């Protein structure tokens, strides 16, 4: 509304739109803690 126009829907795709969050929003050094034959 300031001038650029609606930004919530207009997010310049950087190719890593989702990826970005995937590995960069890790609460802490990913945990590999394997689970016992659950499946």
């Amino acid at each position: 509304m300031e001038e650029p126009q609606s930004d919530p829907s207009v997010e310049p795709p950087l190719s890593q739109e989702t990826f970005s969050d995937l590995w960069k929003l890790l609460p802490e050094n990913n945990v590999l803690s394997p689970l016992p034959s659950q499946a």
């Binding site: 795709p13 739109e17 989702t18 969050d21 995937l22 590995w23 929003l25 803690s33 689970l35």
Partner: protein
């Protein structure tokens, strides 16, 4: 001509899906797709945390939603996908 960010967003999740669906289905461990290893890192981590699995992490919150769209379209309970089981099995 419809192509737009909306399509980029759809393509964004498609790539994430390609790795999430593949990484969540190809539990090889030695996956040769850097995207997979990194996604496993994400999935393998997602469960490692119980608070995160509840949506605590934007990663889980967003992944759960992404999973929601996929688990919805997929009328079949894939099986390896944790969330699908949590939504379709429960």
């Amino acid at each position: 001509a419809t192509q737009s960010p909306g399509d980029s967003r759809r393509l964004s999740i498609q790539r994430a899906i390609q790795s999430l669906v593949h990484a969540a289905q190809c539990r090889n461990a030695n996956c040769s797709l850097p995207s997979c290893q990194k996604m496993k890192r994400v999935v393998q981590h997602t469960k490692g945390c119980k608070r995160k699995t509840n949506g605590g992490c934007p990663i889980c919150k967003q992944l759960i939603a992404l999973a929601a769209y996929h688990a919805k379209h997929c009328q079949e309970n894939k099986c390896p996908v944790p969330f699908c089981l949590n939504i379709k099995q429960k």
